[PDB]
Amino acid sequence: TTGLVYDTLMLKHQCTCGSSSSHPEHAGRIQSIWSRLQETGLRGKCECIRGRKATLEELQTVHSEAHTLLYGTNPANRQKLDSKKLLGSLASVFVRLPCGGVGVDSDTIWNEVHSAGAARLAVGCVVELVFKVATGELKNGFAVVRPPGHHAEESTPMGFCYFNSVAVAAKLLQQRLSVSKILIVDWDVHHGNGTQQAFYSDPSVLYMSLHRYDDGNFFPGSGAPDEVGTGPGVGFNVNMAFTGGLDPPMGDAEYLAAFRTVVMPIASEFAPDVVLVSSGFDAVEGHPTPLGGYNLSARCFGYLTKQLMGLAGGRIVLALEGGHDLTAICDASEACVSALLGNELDPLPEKVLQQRPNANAVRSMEKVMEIHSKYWRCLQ
Which residues sit in the known binding site for Zn(2+)?
15, 17, 23, 99
* Contact residue for Zn ion among 36, 67, 190, 299 (CB under 5 A): 190
Cis ω before 220 (30° cut-off from 0): yes
Minimum distance from residue 194 beta carbon to Zn ion (Å): 12
C-alpha closest to that of 215 among 241, 247, 195: 241
Binding string, residues 213-252; x marks residues near Zn ion by CB under 5 A: ----------------------------------------
C-alpha closest to that of 146 among 13, 21, 281, 327: 13
Closest to Na ion by CB, 9 vs 24, is 24
| Residue 153 interacts with Na ion (CB under 5 A): yes or no | no
Residue 209, binding choice from Zn ion, Na ion, ligand OTF, none, Cβ under 5 to 8 Å by partner class: Na ion
User: For residues 105 and 86, what is the distance between their CA atoms, to the nearest angstrom?
Assistant: 20
Closest to Na ion by CB, 51 vs 148, is 148
* Contact residue for Na ion among 209, 261, 279, 360 (CB under 5 A): 209
* Contact residue for ligand OTF among 282, 325, 331, 334 (CB under 6 A): 282
- Chain positions 287 to 326 lying near ligand OTF, rule: CB under 6 A, are 290-291, 321-322, 324
Closest to ligand OTF by CB, 218 vs 270, is 218
User: For residues 11 and 121, what is the distance between their CA atoms, to the nearest angstrom?
Assistant: 11
Binding string, residues 210-249; x marks residues near ligand OTF by CB under 6 A: ---------x------------------------------
Window contacting Na ion (CB under 5 A); options: 5-13, 179-187, 282-290, 365-373: 179-187
* Contact residue for ligand OTF among 142, 160, 200, 259 (CB under 6 A): 160
Q: Are 10 and 118 in contact (CB under 8 A)?
A: yes
Q: Are 188 and 321 in contact (CB under 8 A)?
A: yes
Minimum distance from residue 321 beta carbon to Na ion (Å): 8
Q: Count residues binding ligand OTF (CB under 6 A).
A: 16
Collapsing DSSP states into helix, strand and coil, what is residue 179?
coil
Sheet with 140-143: list strands edge to edge: 47-49, 2-5, 140-143, 316-320, 274-279, 182-186, 205-212, 237-242
| Residue 117 interacts with Zn ion (CB under 5 A): yes or no | no
* Contact residue for Zn ion among 3, 72, 322, 357 (CB under 5 A): 322
Burial class (CB in 10 A: 0-12, 13-18, 19+), 169: buried
Q: What is the DSSP string of 290-353?
A: TS----B-TTHHHHHHHHHHTSGGG-EEEEE-----HHHHHHHHHHHHHHHTTPPPPPPPHHHH
Minimum distance from residue 213 beta carbon to ligand OTF (Å): 14
| Residue 110 interacts with ligand OTF (CB under 6 A): yes or no | no
Cis ω before 272 (30° cut-off from 0): no
Contacts of 233 (CB under 8 A, 6+ apart): 199, 200, 201, 202, 203
Window contacting Na ion (CB under 5 A); options: 69-77, 104-112, 120-128, 188-196: 188-196
* Contact residue for ligand OTF among 72, 124, 159, 357 (CB under 6 A): 159
Q: What is the DSSP letter of 380?
A: -
| Residue 24 interacts with ligand OTF (CB under 6 A): yes or no | yes
- Which one is catalytic: 150, 151, 324, 372? 151
**67 catalytic per annotation:** no
C-alpha closest to that of 137 among 21, 228, 5: 5
Classify strands 95-96 and 47-49 as parallel, antiparallel or unpaired: unpaired
Q: Annotated binding site: which residue ranges?
A: 15, 17, 23, 99
* Contact residue for ligand OTF among 13, 139, 171, 190 (CB under 6 A): 190
* Contact residue for Na ion among 186, 321, 325, 334 (CB under 5 A): 186
| Residue 15 interacts with Zn ion (CB under 5 A): yes or no | yes
Looking at the annotation, which residues are catalytic? Answer: 151
Q: Which residues bind Na ion (CB under 5 A)?
A: 186, 188, 209, 211
